Amino acid sequence: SIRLPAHLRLQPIYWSRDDVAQWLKWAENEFSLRPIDSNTFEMNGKALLLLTKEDFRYRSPHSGDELYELLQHILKQ
Amino acid sequence: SIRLPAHLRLQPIYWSRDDVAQWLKWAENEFSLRPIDSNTFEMNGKALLLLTKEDFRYRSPHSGDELYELLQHILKQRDHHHHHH
Amino acid sequence: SIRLPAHLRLQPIYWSRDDVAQWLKWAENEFSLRPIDSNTFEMNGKALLLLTKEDFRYRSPHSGDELYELLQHILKQ
C-alpha cells in the first residue's frame, strides 16, 4: 500500500513549498527513485496541481512520470 | 478551488491588456509565484490566447508552466460555465 | 507459456529496484528484445505499478508496450 508520513497527510492543495520538497524526498526513499534536486519543482502544492504530466517529465526525466502518477494516486485516495 | 475576482471572471478573450496585468498580480499571490514583472505579457487577452506554452516559458522562466496551465484551467472553467445545465 | 525464474515469482508489488532490473534482464532474453538498459526503470515494483503504458512506451521505444503487457500478464497469473 501507499501511506504518507503524518506531516504529509493533508490534501496536496494545501502543501507548502517545504511540503512538496518533503514529498519528493519521501517518494525517493519509498520508491527507490533516482535522487533529484527538489528545486526542480520550485512551487507549493496548489501550483504543483497545475502541472501537466509532461511538465513533471521534463523536470525529472528519470522519475517525473512516476511522481505524477503517485500524486494522482494520492488525490484519488 | 480557483476563483478569480469579478473583473476577471469573464472569458479571457474579453480581457483587456490591463486585465491581463491584473491577472498576473492575482496569480502571483494566489499561487505564491516568484515576483512576476509587469511587462511579462503586454497585450490583451485575445493576444495572450495565441501564445504557446513555450512562449510562456520564455517570458516567465520561473513561472511559465504554472501561468500557462492556470490559463488553461480558466478556459476550462469558462467552458463549463457556458455549457453545463 | 510464460514462466518467471524462481527469484522473480514474488508479486511485482514486492519487487525491489534490483528485482525490476532482473525482470528486464529475463524479459530481454525470453522475448528476444533489443537491449534494455538496466536503469530503464530506476524504481521498485510498487513504483513500476503506478506507471502507465504510455510511460513504458516513452521509456522503452523498442519494447515498452511488450513489457507493459508482460507485466499485466504476470499480474493476471
Curated annotation (Swiss-Prot), chains A, C:
Organism annotation: Homo sapiens (Human)
Interval of the full protein contained in this chain: 47 to 123 of 452
Subunit structure: Can form homodimers or heterodimers with TEL2 or FLI1. Interacts with L3MBTL1 and HDAC9.
Superkingdom of origin: Eukaryota
Site (Breakpoint for translocation to form ETV6-MDS2 in MDS): L8, R9
Disease: A chromosomal aberration involving ETV6 is found in a form of chronic myelomonocytic leukemia (CMML). Translocation t(5;12)(q33;p13) with PDGFRB. It is characterized by abnormal clonal myeloid proliferation and by progression to acute myelogenous leukemia (AML). Chromosomal aberrations involving ETV6 are found in acute myeloid leukemia (AML). Translocation t(12;22)(p13;q11) with MN1. Translocation t(4;12)(q12;p13) with CHIC2.
Tissue-wise expression: Ubiquitous.
Subcellular location: Nucleus
Name of the protein this chain belongs to: Transcription factor ETV6
Disulphide bridges, residue numbers: none
Residue numbers marked as site, Breakpoint for translocation to form PAX5-ETV6: R9, L10
Domain (PNT) ranges: 1-77
UniProt family annotation: Belongs to the ETS family.
Function of the molecule: Transcriptional repressor; binds to the DNA sequence 5'-CCGGAAGT-3'. Plays a role in hematopoiesis and malignant transformation.
